[PDB]
Amino acid sequence: NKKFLPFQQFGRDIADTTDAVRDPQTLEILDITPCSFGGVSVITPGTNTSNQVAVLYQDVNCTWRVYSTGSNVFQTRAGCLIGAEHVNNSYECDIPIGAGICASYQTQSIIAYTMSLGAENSVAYSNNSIAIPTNFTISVTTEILPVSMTKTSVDCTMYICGDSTECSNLLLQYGSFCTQLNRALTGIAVEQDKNTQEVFAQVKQIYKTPPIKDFGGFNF
């Protein structure tokens, strides 16, 4: 529907790509739209257990631009999932498809379902009722936190030029860059030691446990 002026032949968008073109014989305006469109994802349960896959087409509304149609076509808010069977149950998420849908390798085939948030529960609120425990449990849980990473150093001359003397001579125009890289790496390297010292060196007195292991029944 664009109306070109008589002196114009091509049309360009904000990316400078050609969008509208006038046919030089019929003098009608035509639009150019790319042929490729839409995202594609593959869901695999691991190649060491099965070869079967399911493909999720994120720009298709199945109610097509698909590689193959097969069977078990299921529509989700994240796209059209082909190669997986829909179930009405609800389990914990195993492979995240998206938009509340997850996938798993159950009974073999690939199945898709709506993830369950957890067991439904209700607390009996009353105006004059309270719940007070009569017993207790002492539980121990693990919490793992990284503290440091590997310290690395880089030599530009050896990485870029190797033993090439001509390249090494040509590299003298970029020495500030290597100074900067080595400075950053040295900062990282000293920061890791600072991290370890901060986390573990809170106390500077090495207390020792005595041979009297009588802790009242607690065994450490």
Ligand X SMILES: *[C@@H]1O[C@H](CO)[C@@H](O)[C@H](O)[C@H]1NC(C)=O
Ligand Y SMILES: *[C@@H]1O[C@H](CO)[C@@H](O[C@@H]2O[C@H](CO)[C@@H](O)[C@H](O)[C@H]2NC(C)=O)[C@H](O)[C@H]1NC(C)=O
Residues that bind ligand X (CB under 6 A): 48, 86-88, 127, 214, 216
**Interacting stretch for other proteins, rule CB under 8 A, among 44-52, 83-91, 103-111, 146-154?**
146-154
User: What does residue 167 show for φ and ψ, rounded to 5 degrees?
Assistant: -65, -40
Measured from the CB of residue 213, what is the shortest distance to ligand X in angstroms?
Answer: 11
Name the phi and psi angles at 41, rounded to 5.
-130, 150
- Beta bridge mates, 31: 20
DSSP state of 175: H
Interface residues for other proteins in 152-211 (CB under 8 A)? 152, 154, 156, 159-162, 164, 166-167, 170-171, 174, 177, 181, 184-185, 188, 191-192, 195-196, 198-200, 202
User: 46 in helix, strand or coil?
Assistant: coil
DSSP H or E segment with residue 102: strand 101-106
Residue with tokens 């901060």: 198
Site for other proteins in 62-101 (CB under 8 A): 65, 77-79, 93, 96, 98-100
| Site membership for ligand Y, residue 121 (CB under 6 A) | no
Q: What's the rounded Cα separation, in Å, for the pair 159 and 146?
A: 30
Q: How far is the CB of 193 from other proteins (least distance, A)?
A: 11
Interface with ligand Y (CB under 6 A): 61, 63, 77, 124, 129, 131, 134-135, 213, 219
